[PDB]
Amino acid sequence: KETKHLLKIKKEDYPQIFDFLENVPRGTKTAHIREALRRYIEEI
Amino acid sequence: KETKHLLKIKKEDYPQIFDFLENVPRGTKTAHIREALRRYIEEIG
Amino acid sequence: KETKHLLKIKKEDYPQIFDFLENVPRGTKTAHIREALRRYIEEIG
Amino acid sequence: KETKHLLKIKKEDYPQIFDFLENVPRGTKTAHIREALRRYIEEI
DNA sequence: AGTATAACAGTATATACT
DNA sequence: AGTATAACAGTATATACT
Numbered sequence: 001k002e003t004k005h006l007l008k009i010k011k012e013d014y015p016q017i018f019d020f021l022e023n024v025p026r027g028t029k030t031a032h033i034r035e036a037l038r039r040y041i042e043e044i
Numbered sequence: 045k046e047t048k049h050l051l052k053i054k055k056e057d058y059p060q061i062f063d064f065l066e067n068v069p070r071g072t073k074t075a076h077i078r079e080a081l082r083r084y085i086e087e088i089g
Numbered sequence: 090k091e092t093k094h095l096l097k098i099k100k101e102d103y104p105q106i107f108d109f110l111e112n113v114p115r116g117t118k119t120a121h122i123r124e125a126l127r128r129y130i131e132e133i134g
Numbered sequence: 135k136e137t138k139h140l141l142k143i144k145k146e147d148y149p150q151i152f153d154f155l156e157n158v159p160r161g162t163k164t165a166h167i168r169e170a171l172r173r174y175i176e177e178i
Numbered sequence: 179a180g181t182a183t184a185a186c187a188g189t190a191t192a193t194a195c196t
Numbered sequence: 197a198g199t200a201t202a203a204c205a206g207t208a209t210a211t212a213c214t
Contacts (some may be wrong), residue, residue: 001055003065007077008205011045013115017081021047027214030051030180033077036084037061040076043083048183065134070147071188074206075114077197090145090149091170092155093201096164106171110137116206119188122141122167123175126151128177142187161196164198
């Protein structure tokens with residue numbers, strides 16, 4: 001299976017996370033989100 | 045502004061992540077990921 | 090069906106609860122309370 | 135100050151929590167929610 | 179696979195009766 | 197104070213280009 005999910009982050013609501021996603025080299029985005037999750041999980 | 049990005053996590057390749065998103069309380073997916081990144085980010089630079 | 094109930098927690102009477110709800114991630118209030126009760130409930134009967 | 139919040143629980147989505155709120159004697163509802171929170175908090 | 183874009187409960191408030 | 201009721205991002209999907 002697969003879990004699809006559309007995430008939206010907002011300019012004024014969360015700037016830094018916004019800037020982050022917007023400058024990550026295209027082709028690595030999912031990789032990160034995935035990583036950020038990988039840790040966020042153990043780190044729980 | 046808004047960044048839209050749809051991600052797909054495949055059951056097989058990364059079970060734990062899949063399993064996670066798939067079983068988080070209703071209406072927490074965006075919150076969680078949003079949290080995960082927040083922490084990830086500064087953890088880096 | 091649906092149960093609607095609006096609660097009000099006063100800063101003074103129960104600071105900690107107030108402070109909590111007031112600083113939980115966006116779109117998690119219903120989830121959290123929903124969680125709190127879930128646990129509360131069976132903890133009882 | 136005060137924090138107001140309208141919570142809605144659904145029949146088919148979460149039955150037990152639904153039944154609970156629906157049978158608690160009227161005048162004690164907030165008291166509980168508040169209690170459930172009181173613990174949910176320390177218990178964190 | 180990663181990415182770019184394109185229709186149906188929480189959140190916030192308010193009035194009013196016990 | 198507790199309670200009863202009354203308008204504006206997440207969630208889910210899909211198509212399509214690299």
